[PDB]
Amino acid sequence: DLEVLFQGPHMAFEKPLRKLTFADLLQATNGFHNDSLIGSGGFGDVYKAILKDGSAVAIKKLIHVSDREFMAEMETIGKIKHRNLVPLLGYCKVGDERLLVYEFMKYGSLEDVLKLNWSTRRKIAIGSARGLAFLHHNCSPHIIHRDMKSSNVLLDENLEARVSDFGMARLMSAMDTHLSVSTLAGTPGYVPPEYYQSFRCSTKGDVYSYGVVLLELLTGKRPTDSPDFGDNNLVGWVKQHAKLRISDVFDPELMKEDPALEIELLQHLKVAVACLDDRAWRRPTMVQVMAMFKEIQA
Amino acid sequence: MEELQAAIQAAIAHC
Numbered sequence A: 001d002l003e004v005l006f007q008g009p010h011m012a013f014e015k016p017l018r019k020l021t022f023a024d025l026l027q028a029t030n031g032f033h034n035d036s037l038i039g040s041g042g043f044g045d046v047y048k049a050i051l052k053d054g055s056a057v058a059i060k061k062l063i064h065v066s067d068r069e070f071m072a073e074m075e076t077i078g079k080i081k082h083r084n085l086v087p088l089l090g091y092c093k094v095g096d097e098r099l100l101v102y103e104f105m106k107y108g109s110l111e112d113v114l115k116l117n118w119s120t121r122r123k124i125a126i127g128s129a130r131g132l133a134f135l136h137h138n139c140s141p142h143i144i145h146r147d148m149k150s151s152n153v154l155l156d157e158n159l160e161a162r163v164s165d166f167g168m169a170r171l172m173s174a175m176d177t178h179l180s181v182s183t184l185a186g187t188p189g190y191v192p193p194e195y196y197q198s199f200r201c202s203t204k205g206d207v208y209s210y211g212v213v214l215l216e217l218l219t220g221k222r223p224t225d226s227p228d229f230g231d232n233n234l235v236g237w238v239k240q241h242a243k244l245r246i247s248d249v250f251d252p253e254l255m256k257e258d259p260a261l262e263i264e265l266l267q268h269l270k271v272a273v274a275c276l277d278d279r280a281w282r283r284p285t286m287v288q289v290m291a292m293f294k295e296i297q298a
Numbered sequence B: 001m002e003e004l005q006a007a008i009q010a011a012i013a014h015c
């Protein structure tokens, strides 16, 4: 049957970003207090809070060097709504202060939460896939996220995926195949091969980073620095381990609930590897990844 | 690469 991929919120009727006063966020974080801290950060610290509306938010205090990550976020996630993208609700810009206020996502990031069975994990892979295809295939210019990872997948009340952290994000004209940057930005164990060779990002880069995050869901392990790995990231630990046995790489917890999903779990691993191809052009688009997951389920 | 993906399909077929 025929799917329509993107039928999320019409933007014209959507709540605009609320420009928030500093004093407001200062009071609600109880003084940007350490106990109100959720996120010790690359680009800022993240404070849990409740506004004067009663609405739960997560506030990102961005660190002022002597405002690119602010503007990266305003120009991309601040312009768009989708069920699988975190809702940026408002912002604050005073003097040299740049704050970003998000809807608070009840179960925090996926990494922290890794308390969820297989049906719940595939719901996370698919929903996280869908949100990355939004960025690639349904925005123009395309959005290249440039930092996909477990801690950048948040989880709501119903445990659906919500792609997060757009501080790295970049707009790329639909007419272009790549975009040229200045530095190598990434999170260790997530960085695609060709980014080490060139200062260029692409949507195909995001596809690589995506697959790693699929392994995390398959195997239940961190992407780097776990006891079994030895020398390599889990891209290496999955790639070599295979010939020995494939089904051993899977998270015990999934396998333990049922011997019947042994096969449903293998095919999802075929998708993840395809994303992890060393030649960008051979990788599925986030839209092909979605069809891959849907074929599997019939 | 080709090997790895082929290896995975071998496995799936078997099961």
Ligand SMILES: Nc1ncnc2c1ncn2[C@@H]1O[C@H](COP(=O)(O)OP(=O)(O)NP(=O)(O)O)[C@@H](O)[C@H]1O
Pocket (backbone or CB within 6 Å): A038, A039, A040, A041, A042, A043, A044, A046, A057, A058, A086, A102, A103, A104, A105, A106, A108, A109, A112, A151, A152, A154, A164, A165
């Ligand atoms: N809207 C939100 N709702 C709930 N939790 C959030 C929200 N935004 C951020 N977080 C939390 O903040 C953490 C991520 O902060 P952020 O800087 O945006 O990403 P990050 O990758 O973890 N940064 P870092 O790991 O230090 O390089 C996650 O573990 C979440 O617990």
